Amino acid sequence: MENFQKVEKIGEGTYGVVYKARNKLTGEVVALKKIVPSTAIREISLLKELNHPNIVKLLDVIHTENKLYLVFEFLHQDLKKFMDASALTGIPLPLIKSYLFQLLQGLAFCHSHRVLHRDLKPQNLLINTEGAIKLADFGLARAFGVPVRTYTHEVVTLWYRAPEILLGCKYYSTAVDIWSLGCIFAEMVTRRALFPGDSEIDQLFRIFRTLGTPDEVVWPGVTSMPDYKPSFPKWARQDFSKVVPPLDEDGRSLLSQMLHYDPNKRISAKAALAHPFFQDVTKPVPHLRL
Ligand SMILES: Fc1ccccc1-c1cc(NCc2ccncc2)n2nccc2n1
Questions:
Q1: Mapping DSSP to helix (H, G, I), strand (E, B) and coil, where does residue 289 land?
Q2: What are the binding positions for ATP in this chain?
Q3: Ligand 1 site, residue 10, Cβ cutoff 6 A
Q4: Annotated binding residue at 103?
């Protein structure tokens, strides 16, 4: 750690403080994350090779005196701040589309290596002045787990959590990231979180109020999952035209596929990239005030 000068705290992450820092040597500006069982070290070490333009680069791992630090490529802003700033007029559809397209490429690459994110949210989707967006903290959930509360006791949000996780599936898949990204897509479009649950049941019931209570017809095997209760209320599914106006039919079609209940049938990142919604994708440059 003597090789880095902390510049400022840029966030309180799931696992510890996140700092902007400078490599006293090279002068490189990085993000430094404070987080060790050998299994966790091996998993993190493998992430050093999971390189892609839409994945925040893991530069190095420092483990000294039993304290662990991850060193990442630095990006200047997150999607949460950008959405808050763009709220009066909303993020233009071409930019939402470019961001969704890029995020799907990051997911497709990681998922091809069977690496999950598991905790996508606006706070870990990072943007630069060039119109790129990148996913931060990919693979960390498998290495360290996803706790109920962060190191600062902050509640880890449930808003983007896939229903199979909430229903107690032990061996959930890459589909959980597609669900989270669908929730984020809806939020960019409407300027409001889609499912802002404040407990596991409120999260689950919010999903059900919009998408309908799942049953054996739409999700074969759902009634067998650990946390499924036959006493869940039965809500009817809402039309997406009500849920995400004024998104066009291509976007609604893709969203509906990203929010399928049955994880085996939820669209993959690779298939989503081919959806007609991306026929006219471009790469606009966002207005960033840093
Ligand atoms: F991914 C994260 C989760 C939670 C907290 C921070 C992060 C977080 C935030 C950033 N940069 C964005 C930024 C820059 C300056 N001020 C604020 C944010 N960065 N940059 C690389 C990793 C990272 N992780």
A1: coil
A2: 10-18, 33, 73-75, 78, 121-124, 137
A3: yes
A4: no
Mutate to test the pocket of ligand 1, among 30, 32, 126 (most ligand atoms within 8 A of CB): 126
Last residue of a domain, one of 44, 76, 108: 76
Joined tokens for residue 145: 């787990």
178 closest CA partner among 192, 189, 165: 165
The phi and psi torsions of 173 (rounded to 5 degrees) equal: -120, -170
Sheet bearing 125-127, strands edge to edge:
77-78, 125-127, 133-135
Range list of H helices, 3-75: 38-47
Structure tokens at 228: 């499924």
Query: Closest Cα partner for 146 from 159, 162, 157?
Result: 157
Indicate if ligand 1 lies below 6 Å from the C-beta of 157: no
Nearest to 204 by CA among 157, 167, 242: 167
What is the rounded distance in angstroms from the CA atom of residue 158 to the CA atom of residue 162?
Answer: 9
Q: Do residues 34 and 55 both lie within one domain?
A: yes
Asked if 47 and 179 sit in the same domain, the reply is no
Active site residue 119: yes
Cβ of 100 closer than 6 Å to ligand 1, yes or no, is: no
41 & 142 share domain:
no
Give the CA dihedral 253, 158, 30, 102, nearest 10 degrees.
Answer: 0
Q: Which of 58, 76, 94 marks a domain boundary?
A: 76
Which protein residue has the closest C-alpha to ligand 1 atom 13?
77
